[PDB]
């Protein structure tokens, strides 16, 4: 894995090790845990532990033991601790971790397993031995320096929604959003803005109360001329939808549920400067995909 969208919540910076912190939400499937740091020049071993509570006597059960160890070979040791007793070790060699090297660990929770990627490469999978609903604390021990920890939950898609685009906007770039208009929705908006110039390159504003689709750009602290022509208002309150914002060389092509909706001639000509996605309004956000 390698997150295309940066929308981590509850960002933690430079935590002191050992760090024992409460996971601010339940680890439901689709949940991501992102840990960034580096291995000190001495480091013999360190561990990331998803635990059920933080009692240390008796030692809290460790639902998921992620234990990178540095030795001749070099590996990542995984296990589970119930009633202070270790279960069967699952060991992965060809360790992505190395001394004096920085890393990004993405721990993804699946219905039946944890899937782990380190530095954009798949590293290992881990079957749940303890229900994940029982995990509420993150423990980090050993010789490792933590720069930042971040999370992505179900609420991670709560509104207002803001997210950075880890891949510059440019021709061929697609952005899709799936969601559902609320039953009594007035309107909602999806914007592509340029963080730098705090400009709104594309403002897609479906308004359900007036059955119209306002499209415009906000540049130089000002709204331009609106674009509302459309063969037919595609949105209806309470309706599930998927929207495709496709950036092309001269304009944006936007479709809803597999049917073309409109085109929008680029007003912000620095396509690459479009590094932000904002979603807000009267809808239920279900999914967002950059690429
Ligand atoms: C030294 C200390 O302060 N406590 C350690 C503990 C203790 O060594 C003791 O195990 C407490 O019960 O070890 C901790 O790491 C252990 C953990 O990584 C488990 C995971 O399987 O392995 C233990 O070592 C194994 C070893 O991998 C096997 O090859 C061997 O056959 O058995 C050993 C023990 O079963 C690690 O020591 C721990 O959290 O329990 C780290 C503490 O800081
Ligand atoms: O242009 C998008 C921008 O519109 C603002 O509202 C406008 C409205 O679109 C226009 O038809 C009317 O004449 O003037 C309103 C006041 O500017 C929204 O407030 C803003 O959020 C965007 O949606």
UniProtKB/Swiss-Prot annotation:
It comes from Homo sapiens. A carbohydrate binds at residues 69, 79, 89. GO terms for molecular function: carbohydrate binding; integrin binding. A beta-D-galactoside binds at residues 223-229. This is Galectin-8. Contains two homologous but distinct carbohydrate-binding domains. The record marks 59 as: Critical for binding to sialylated and sulfated oligosaccharides. It comes from the Eukaryota. One of its GO terms (cellular component) is cytoplasm. One of its GO terms (biological process) is T cell costimulation. Homodimer. Interacts with CALCOCO2/NDP52. Interacts with PDPN; the interaction is glycosylation-dependent; may participate in connection of the lymphatic endothelium to the surrounding extracellular matrix. Residues 19-152, 161-291 form the Galectin domain. The keyword Heme does not apply. Pfam families: Gal-bind_lectin. It is found in: Cytoplasmic vesicle; Cytoplasm, Cytosol. Keywords: Autophagy, Cytoplasm, Cytoplasmic vesicle, Lectin, Repeat. Ubiquitous. Selective expression by prostate carcinomas versus normal prostate and benign prostatic hypertrophy. Beta-galactoside-binding lectin that acts as a sensor of membrane damage caused by infection and restricts the proliferation of infecting pathogens by targeting them for autophagy. Detects membrane rupture by binding beta-galactoside ligands located on the lumenal side of the endosome membrane; these ligands becoming exposed to the cytoplasm following rupture. Restricts infection by initiating autophagy via interaction with CALCOCO2/NDP52. Required to restrict infection of bacterial invasion such as S.typhimurium. Also required to restrict infection of Picornaviridae viruses.
